[PDB]
Amino acid sequence: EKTFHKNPIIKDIYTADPAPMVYGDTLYLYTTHDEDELVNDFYTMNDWRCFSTKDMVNWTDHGAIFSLDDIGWADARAWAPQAVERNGKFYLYCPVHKRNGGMAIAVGISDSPTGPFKDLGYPLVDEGDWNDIDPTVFIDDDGQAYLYFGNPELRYVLLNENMITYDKEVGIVKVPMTEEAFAKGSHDTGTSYGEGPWFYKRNDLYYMVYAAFGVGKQNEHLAYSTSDSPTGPWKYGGVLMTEEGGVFTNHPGIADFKGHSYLFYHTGDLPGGSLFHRSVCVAEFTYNEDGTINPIPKCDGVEKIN
């Protein structure tokens, strides 16, 4: 019986920007995909992948579940996604380049967590600028869903119950980009907030985890902030994972599965790995009693769970 799985999770394909979703007895891990053959020696990202597990050590590869070619209005940049389930359907939020436009958020819909996903037909969020990447979605206890996104500015909308529209009266809301919320740092706002927001609630505390840029630093680390409310005010928490052992990017995804807590992240540790050929990894961790989280070291692998 296999009882351990050594990182990186998947070894025959380069993956990044992990977004776990637990539904019932199964954890589904959605990722971006760094092509084996790079175009112009640079990031080459066309489709999204899904890998599932029932036990954290045996993984099933579902291949491409959605792609830029499935989105009629988008031409480039299959960037960090997140999926969510609601009312018997699965929604995949994907940041992409809108042809002849800026960065927009697509929503794909499927009756299955492993697709194939069908694009809505037009963008869900489309402000005309280049900020709105790396969406994260969470459905709160009161039934209100939120969609956060952005680099270098964190923004959100209130998603409606159908998950394919948002409240246009509230519109797109900007988060104040303060040191109080996101620490001092080297990103465009002068705070450490970078990209890859990951929004959720656990035991009456809300969390915003993100890729971050420290003062005087070039590479991303992972950090987090907290709030008593889903829309703030956000207060800086601390470092969740340092840059050590990583590549220029890191990107967080957190899930509880069968009573255990996991941080998914990425590195360039696969054979032939690099900043453009990444690999998703996972570390188990535990929360402090007061809801804070100590820094998580990079991890050799995880144990089977039941």
The residue whose Cβ lies closest to Ca ion is: 80
Figure out which of the listed residues 57, 80, 106, 211 binds Ca ion, where binding follows CB under 5 A: 80
How many residues bind Ca ion, per CB under 5 A? 2
Q: Among residues 57 and 71, whose Cβ is nearest to Ca ion?
A: 71
Site string for Ca ion, 34-53 (x = CB under 5 A): --------------------
- Give catalytic status of residue 195 as yes or no: yes
Distance CA 76, CA 131 (A): 15
Minimum distance of Ca ion from residue 25's CB (angstroms) = 24
What are the phi and psi torsion angles at 179 (to 5°)?
Answer: -65, -35
Q: Answer for the pair 238, 253: CB distance below 8 angstroms, yes or no.
A: no
The secondary structure of the chain in percent helix, strand, coil, rounded to multiples of 5, reads 0, 50, 50
Element (H, E) at 182: helix 179-182
Of 17, 70, 134, 220, which one is the catalytic site residue?
Answer: 17
Q: Among residues 55 and 156, whose Cβ is nearest to Ca ion?
A: 156
Instruction: Work out whether 154 is an interface residue with Ca ion (CB under 5 A).
Output: no
Site string for Ca ion, 176-205 (x = CB under 5 A): --------------------x---------
Q: Answer for the pair 277, 10: CB distance below 8 angstroms, yes or no.
A: no
Of 55, 119, 195, 220, which one is the catalytic site residue?
Answer: 195
Sites for Ca ion among residues 219-258 (CB under 5 A): none
Return the DSSP state at 180: H
Q: Answer for the pair 158, 144: CB distance below 8 angstroms, yes or no.
A: yes
Q: Among residues 57 and 83, whose Cβ is nearest to Ca ion?
A: 83
* Secondary structure class of 179 (helix, strand, coil): helix
Instruction: Work out whether 96 is an interface residue with Ca ion (CB under 5 A).
Output: no
Tell me: is residue 266 an annotated ligand-binding position. no
CA angle 149, 278, 96 (to 5 degrees): 35
4 token code pair: 């351990």
- Give catalytic status of residue 17 as yes or no: yes
Instruction: Work out whether 125 is an interface residue with Ca ion (CB under 5 A).
Output: no
Q: Answer for the pair 84, 103: CB distance below 8 angstroms, yes or no.
A: no
Bind-site residues: 251
Active site members: 17, 195
Could you list the residues that contact Ca ion (CB under 5 A)?
Answer: 80, 196
Bind-site residues for Ca(2+): 251
